[PDB]
Amino acid sequence: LAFANTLLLFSLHGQFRLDTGSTSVGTALTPKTATITAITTFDIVDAIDPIGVGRTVYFGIPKGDFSGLREYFLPDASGPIPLSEEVTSSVPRFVPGNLISMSPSVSEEVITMISKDQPRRVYIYKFFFDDDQKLQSSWSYWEVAANKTLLGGNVLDSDLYTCVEYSDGVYLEKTQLRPETVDSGTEFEILLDRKTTEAACSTSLINSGALGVQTVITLPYPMSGTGTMAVVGRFASNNTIAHGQVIKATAETLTGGASGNGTMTVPGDLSSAKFFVGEIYNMTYEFSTPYLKETPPGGGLAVLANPRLQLRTWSIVFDETSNFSMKITPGQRDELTYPFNGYKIGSGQFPIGTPSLATGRFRVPVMAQNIETKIVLFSDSPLPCRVQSAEWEGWYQERARRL
Amino acid sequence: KKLFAGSAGTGRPFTHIVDRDGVIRYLIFIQDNAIKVFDLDGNAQTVSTPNGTSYLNITGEPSSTFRVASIADFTFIVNREKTVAMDTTNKSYNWGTKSMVFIKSADFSTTYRVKLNGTEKSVTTGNSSGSAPDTVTIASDLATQLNTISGFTVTSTDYIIRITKDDGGDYTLESSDTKTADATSAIKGTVDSITDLPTIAEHNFTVRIQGSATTAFDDYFVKFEATAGSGFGPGVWRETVAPNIDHLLDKSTMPHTLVRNANGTFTFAQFNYTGRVAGDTTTAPNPTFVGSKIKNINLFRNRLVFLADENVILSAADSFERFFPETVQTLLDSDPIDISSGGTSVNFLNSSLAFANTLLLFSLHGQFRLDTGSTSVGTALTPKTATITAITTFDIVDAIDPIGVGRTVYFGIPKGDFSGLREYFLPDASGPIPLSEEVTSSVPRFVPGNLIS
Amino acid sequence: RLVFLADENVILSAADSFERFFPETVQTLLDSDPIDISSGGTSVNFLNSSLAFANTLLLFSLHGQFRLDTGSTSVGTALTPKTATITAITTFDIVDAIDPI
Fold first, then answer.
1. For residues C20 and C34, is the Cβ–Cβ distance under 8 A?
2. Helices H, strands E: what count in chain A?
3. How far apart are CA B156 and CA B123, in angstroms?
């Protein structure tokens, strides 16, 4: 790799550099001056190449069956030994083995990993820098429907280009990683997989001129009948279907249209409406056990474990969200749900017929003990949802005094 | 004040301002085949165009197509779309199908043989008992002997026999005497060493010297010019360019200049570049910008800097109009430099900046610096020392030119339809990797795309 | 040596001979011959004032600052025609009425 002011070379058990060696970076390279010198003795995997992101280098390290990611930072060419740090120490069993794709994104600070033992998942690592210190370093992974098979991924500018395989061919999909992305002409984005506009699909209608017509839609690509599709009105005016209205099929055929394309049937006449079409994917966020932290005498933070702490109410703070749900399960009892959809009856901020994006707070009771709860933030609508923070109130009982 | 009536055209005009000495200032206005100049009070200054403005014809945006660089008495203008090309019509000198026979000395009882086109004519001199032989008489006899050959023109003067073929075709030449084969020299095409050159010759005569790769010098050529200035006469042999080879640059495509005079009027005319002066096509290859668009221009360390493709081309030392090597026998540190930028990804250089203690070079996906590399900032720039090294892998927008404010460097980055701004701080040249930061992270949809100023 | 300022060029006299400004011989360049450099840059920079401070020679223009040096960590390296140069540093602003101190 050509980076910093040197030519780094990597072996299976060590890292070396090639240089004339002088503080003179552009010294003449001659047969009596070209040498190789060791630097450190870390590890590396040969499946994928190390990459250079920003000012730091990244590469993957082996951890047996599962693989880990280690970055290390190189100061000045004539300067000290480079600094190194492992960022997967807290997740020893997360990233599978046999990696096949690793792509960076400098402007959006995202590193994307695709494995082979899991052909339906994309692993996302998010980092954030300030001068030298590190503020954010998080892990998570996306998912697709139950019939696709990822092959490999690349990144250009700030978009991820993927080459997936369906039951009949290999397609190309484009994904936008930029923040605050918005659909053209409107205020918020509509979330659907395989999202292709109406202009790419042709329609026909059955039993025209009568009440209760149905429209037969011919998608450009063959269906994957295991998943569930939907039709959503797109454009913000002068349309038969209201903005953000969702319609579900009544009779879907996996294939049988022209050229083997899939077909769908919906009520009403949509021969001149504007709408999207695609699949639906779920999001899940499971909170952890809430505890308390206080500064010990030596400095730092310690987590209290002994005192009784019974959670009472759980609240979250959202902004510009339409719909989501909360799923709370106490210890060995029935699961409870608490949905929310933004339409506050009585308030006239959202008239009938327009999508709702609210701003406020929500509160539900949990009624259990901190060590025997599971809190899940669940949402499946094709409308946006984003959450800022949360706050809980509980009963704190101490059976003695604290030193 | 109002500048001029009418509109400025569909494209956005390209504007620059020059501050010379604090009392002289003027605006530069270039758009759509036209170029105009104003002062800070809106009083237009006349501009003369001796060669026309065909160089300024354009199809894209002038703001993102034109680029300027000012030095002393000139202000270079660069068209980022024109494809430069070597001139092929007004070629260099021709060889000429002429040759001479040189007679060095004479000795008693020696027969000279001259072979021309496979036939041999012989002249025999007298022994010691006869008169002293002389090169003049021997050459006269030989010349009148070969003059009988049809299709060839044979003439003699002094000790030189001049041979020329009427149809201009080639022929063989070889002569030898019967003692040592040294007193005769068949000067034809190329010869062994310059030591065999006769004292007198014709001006503009071209001969080739076979160099010795054992000494790590390739071939070269030598040309003649009479001391009298014309005709035949003594003169000098100097290292010259090989004949019958294109050696001129088409000035009608290469960057032009804008000059101000002492009376206030300006002039927009071509620049007088020089062409290949020594060597041949292989030993003095065409500079890498030939056959490809020129991207930007800058001045650094009393040399002219051109950017083209992945290569950076530097002019000769203290001579801004020379781009071909001066001599081909040995390297000189005043010769132009040709450099390619390393990397596993394709990088087309767009903009350059002189700042900190280095010359930064920007690509579409990375950053580079050109330097001797030493902590010795002012080390000599030589062909074995100029280099390009990577620094980082950030992003760059090509519409505008990155600028330098105070001690920091600023440029714009692409955020999709909207555009952002990123600045990065460079400590000492020999020190660590420069620190970088983004300042538009809180406003991802604020600045519109297609920046122009 | 003697230093003059004119246009964009810095002029250095012959070594240890303040009254000589032309090259002594034309056959081979000697290190005692006068030196002339141009301040490179994409903007016109007429030099006005100079100052000898720290371990360098600071030259100021109307819109920037430059330094003349061999550039080496070797402060007392010989000044030769093959080595002299001008390198920019920053781009602050200067008034020409008075000399920086």
1. yes
2. 0, 30
3. 15
Q: How far apart are CA B326 and CA B338, in angstroms?
A: 14
Q: Which two tokens stand for residue A51?
A: 């990459």
Residue located via tokens 């992270």: B441
Tokens describing residue B199? 């004292």
The CA angle A390-A393-A397, to the nearest 5 degrees, is: 140
Distance, CA of A201 to CA of A278 (rounded, Å):
12
Q: How far apart are CA A365 and CA A326, in angstroms?
A: 11
Interchain pair A24, B416: CB under 8 A: no
Q: How far apart are CA A290 and CA A300, in angstroms?
A: 19
Tally Cβ neighbours within 10 Å of residue C27: 5
**DSSP 8-state assignment for residue A277:** E
Between B and C, how many residue pairs show a Cβ–Cβ distance under 8 A?
A: 78
Chain B residues 258-317 within an 8 A CB cutoff of chain A: none
CA distances from residue B40 to A215, A229, B3, B179 in whole angstroms, order as listed: 68, 65, 11, 86
- Give the residue on A whose Cα is nearest the Cα of B383: A28
Q: What is the CA A210 to chain-centroid distance, rounded?
A: 46
Cα end-to-end distance, chain B, whole Å: 22
Which three-class secondary structure state does DSSP give residue B56? helix
Q: Which residues pair with B35 in a beta bridge?
A: B30
CB nearest to A76's CB, from B373, B384, B432: B432
Q: Hey, how many other C-beta atoms are within 10 angstroms of the C-beta on A47?
A: 15
Question: For tokens 């000589």, what's the residue?
Answer: C20
B343/A contact by beta carbon, under 8 A: yes
Contact A339, A323 (CB under 8 A): yes
Q: Which residues contact B308 (CB under 8 A, 6 or more apart)?
A: B288, B289, B292, B293, B294, B295, B349
Question: Residues A269, A270, A273, A279: is their CA dihedral positive or negative?
Answer: positive
Q: CB A55 to CB B344 under 8 A?
A: no
3-class state of residue B360 by DSSP? strand
Contact A36, A29 (CB under 8 A): no
B306: burial class by Cβ within 10 Å (0-12, 13-18, 19+)? buried
Give the residue from A85, A81, A146, A92 showing the smallest Cα distance to A119: A146
Q: C4 — phi, psi (to 5°)?
A: -120, 155
Parallel/antiparallel/unpaired status of strands B206-209 and B190-191: parallel
Q: What totals of helices (H) and strands (E) does chain B contain, helices first?
A: 2, 33
Cα B375 from Cα C71, distance rounded (Å): 7
- DSSP notation for A305-352: -SSEEEEEEEEEEEEEE--BEEEEE-TTS--EE--B-S--TT--SS-T
Please provide residue B137's backbone torsions phi and psi, each rounded to the nearest 5 degrees: -65, -40
Please check whether residue C71 is in contact with residue B430, taking contact to mean a CB–CB distance below 8 angstroms.
Answer: no
Do residues B132 and B100 touch, judged by C-beta distance below 8 A?
no
Q: Which amino acid is at A7?
A: L
**CA proximity to A49, closest of A117, A3, A89, A82:** A3
Q: To the nearest whole angstrom, how far is the Cα of B18 from the nearest Cα of chain C?
A: 8
Q: Are B208 and B189 in contact (CB under 8 A)?
A: yes
Burial of A133 (0-12, 13-18, 19+ CB in 10 A): exposed
The DSSP line for A88-105 is -TT-TTSB-SS--EEE--
Query: How far is B19 from B176, CA to CA, in rounded Å?
Result: 73
Nearest Cβ partner for C44 among B70, B302, B353: B70
| Selection from A364, A165, A393 nearest residue A292 by Cα | A393
User: Taking the alpha carbons of B277, B282, B283, B288 in that order, is the dihedral positive or negative?
Assistant: positive
Spatial CB neighbours of B154, under 8 Å, sequence gap ≥ 6? B143, B144, B146, B147, B161, B162, B163
Site of tokens 């009608």 = B252
CA–CA separation, A160 and A165 (whole Å): 16
